[PDB]
Design an enzyme around this catalytic site. Sequence first.
Site, short mmCIF file in Angstrom:
data_model
loop_
_atom_site.label_atom_id
_atom_site.label_comp_id
_atom_site.label_asym_id
_atom_site.label_seq_id
_atom_site.Cartn_x
_atom_site.Cartn_y
_atom_site.Cartn_z
N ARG B 8 -86.67 -34.86 65.94
CA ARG B 8 -86.00 -35.63 64.94
C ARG B 8 -85.67 -36.90 65.72
O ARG B 8 -85.18 -36.79 67.05
CB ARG B 8 -84.89 -35.02 64.52
CG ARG B 8 -84.02 -35.66 63.78
CD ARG B 8 -82.83 -34.83 63.13
NE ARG B 8 -81.89 -35.43 62.06
CZ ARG B 8 -80.82 -34.99 61.68
NH1 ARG B 8 -80.20 -33.73 61.79
NH2 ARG B 8 -80.13 -35.99 60.80
N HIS B 9 -85.80 -37.96 65.12
CA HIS B 9 -85.31 -39.35 65.97
C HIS B 9 -83.85 -39.48 66.22
O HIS B 9 -83.18 -38.77 65.49
CB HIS B 9 -85.85 -40.39 65.26
CG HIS B 9 -85.52 -40.65 63.87
ND1 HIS B 9 -84.11 -41.05 63.45
CD2 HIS B 9 -85.86 -40.34 62.56
CE1 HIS B 9 -83.87 -41.06 62.28
NE2 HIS B 9 -84.96 -40.78 61.64
N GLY B 10 -83.53 -40.45 66.87
CA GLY B 10 -82.29 -40.67 67.29
C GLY B 10 -81.43 -41.66 66.44
O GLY B 10 -82.03 -41.97 65.18
N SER B 21 -79.84 -44.08 55.33
CA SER B 21 -80.99 -44.94 55.62
C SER B 21 -82.32 -44.94 54.81
O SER B 21 -83.00 -45.78 54.43
CB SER B 21 -81.24 -45.07 57.20
OG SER B 21 -81.66 -43.76 57.58
N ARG B 60 -88.31 -45.76 62.68
CA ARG B 60 -87.76 -45.18 63.76
C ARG B 60 -88.47 -43.96 64.38
O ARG B 60 -88.20 -43.59 65.56
CB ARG B 60 -86.33 -44.80 63.28
CG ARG B 60 -86.45 -44.12 62.01
CD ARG B 60 -84.96 -44.11 61.54
NE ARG B 60 -84.79 -43.47 59.91
CZ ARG B 60 -84.81 -44.05 58.88
NH1 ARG B 60 -85.64 -45.23 58.53
NH2 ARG B 60 -84.68 -43.20 57.81
N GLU B 87 -88.16 -39.55 55.89
CA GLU B 87 -86.85 -39.28 55.41
C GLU B 87 -86.62 -39.39 53.84
O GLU B 87 -87.46 -39.62 53.14
CB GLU B 87 -85.89 -40.42 55.84
CG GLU B 87 -84.26 -40.18 55.67
CD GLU B 87 -83.77 -38.75 56.27
OE1 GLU B 87 -83.88 -37.52 55.30
OE2 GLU B 87 -83.72 -38.67 57.27
N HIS B 184 -88.19 -36.93 60.49
CA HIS B 184 -86.71 -36.89 60.17
C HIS B 184 -85.98 -35.79 59.81
O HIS B 184 -86.77 -34.74 59.69
CB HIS B 184 -86.75 -37.94 59.05
CG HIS B 184 -87.60 -39.24 59.07
ND1 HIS B 184 -86.78 -40.39 59.39
CD2 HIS B 184 -88.53 -39.68 59.19
CE1 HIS B 184 -87.77 -41.19 59.78
NE2 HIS B 184 -89.00 -40.86 59.24
#
Lengths: 239, 233
Positions: B8-10, B21, B60, B87, B184
């Site tokens: 999962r991205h930061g 977002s 991202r 996401e 995500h």
Amino acid sequence: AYKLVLIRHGESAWNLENRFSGWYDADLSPAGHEEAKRGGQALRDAGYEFDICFTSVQKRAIRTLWTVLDAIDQMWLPVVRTWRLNERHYGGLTGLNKAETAAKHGEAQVKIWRRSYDVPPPPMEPDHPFYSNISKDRRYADLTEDQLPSCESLKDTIARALPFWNEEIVPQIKEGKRVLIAAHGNSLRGIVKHLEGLSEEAIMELNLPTGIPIVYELDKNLKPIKPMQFLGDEETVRK
Amino acid sequence: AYKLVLIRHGESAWNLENRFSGWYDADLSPAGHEEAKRGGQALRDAGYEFDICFTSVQKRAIRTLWTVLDAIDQMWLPVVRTWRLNERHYGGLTGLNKAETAAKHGEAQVKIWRRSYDVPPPPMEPDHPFYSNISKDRRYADLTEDQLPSCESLKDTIARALPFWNEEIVPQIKEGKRVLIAAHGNSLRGIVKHLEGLSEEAIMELNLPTGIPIVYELDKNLKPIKPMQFLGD
Ligand SMILES: CN(C)c1ccc(S(=O)(=O)Nc2cc3c(c(O)c2O)C(=O)c2ccccc2C3=O)cc1
Ligand SMILES: [Cl-]
């Protein structure tokens, strides 16, 4: 008019050393990274949009493509990687510099290799320091015996690059999708020679600069309507 | 035992991960980028090798994956991008913080949205600052009118993510290709929920850590042999 953009990877860490990389996976130098960054900014200022990206399996090409996609805000594009866009495979010269090469073979032999279209460097033997590094890299595992080079002439390199051009890139272009190719000078030479119908002799004095976008305008038969244009600031294109 | 890795991205820019977002294409903040670096080093130190990578079409996630591949020296891997790992699409709420949402919609609707699994947020009104930005971005041009979300419940997001998992990722896994997924929180929730046979209630309280590799060991039927393992410190 179809729009096709080509770009040679920015400067590699061995370009600084004058050291033959070939299929050795040398990274960008910081300067080379900035070259790709500036090429990207040239593509962004001109409002360029792409639909698909093609590149080799070598990081200097791949990182050049990444930096460009970052600059033009198109990181979401499909990217296709193929060993067929790799640098020419320099066999035994791989890992050596200009001086070492000259000392080992003489300036006559180096001259001949420099000028010849169909004479390969010596092959990369199993006792060669980079033999395992390149030949046993798992990224080439799906390559057949004949496909995996021990060394390549420009003719060879071009010969394995063009089937990818014909089967994977040309269909994309005819479908009207705007293609970006990030690769190496010698694999790109195949594409240039095929597009402009150049001669063996002519394609050899064609030197493609590193990290500079090259724009082709093609017609329905994918022949250029005009000569290649370099992209970037006046300072850059001046060279 | 097949090995599957999720990440999962930061943190995204401008505190956007706390401002819904969603489908707004926010980049990683420097901190989020550093998280991806540390996850990358964790995979590198453990000697992990992949054969194929999946990600969303959002900046991202893609930059997280680029950072990891850089770290583990496997930038040559084939990479496949899909809107289906995006996401969740928070519609009209996208870009707003808690207070702003509460004020815009009332706390009744907010209460429903925080707890509900299948109640979608409201869609983006034409005066919403991200309206054209998201709904007319060419990366979604090949979506049918019915496919292009205006807003998603968690159920929606999971529902459009699972077909990609079944049709594109499961075949790679059965063929023995070692898969890395960079995506995500909510889409990864879809995949975890499918793998562990979790309930709506269980999946809504599962929060996956950011910037840290999540390792599954699957059997020949692609069921986890053991719980998800985190890689790292
Ligand atoms: C390894 N690097 C970066 C490097 C090596 C040699 C030189 S050089 O000697 O000054 N000039 C120069 C030298 C060469 C070439 C070439 O196109 C060229 O312009 C080749 O294409 C070439 C092809 C096959 C074997 C040798 C050469 C070669 O030695 C310049 C750079
Ligand atoms: Cl990529």
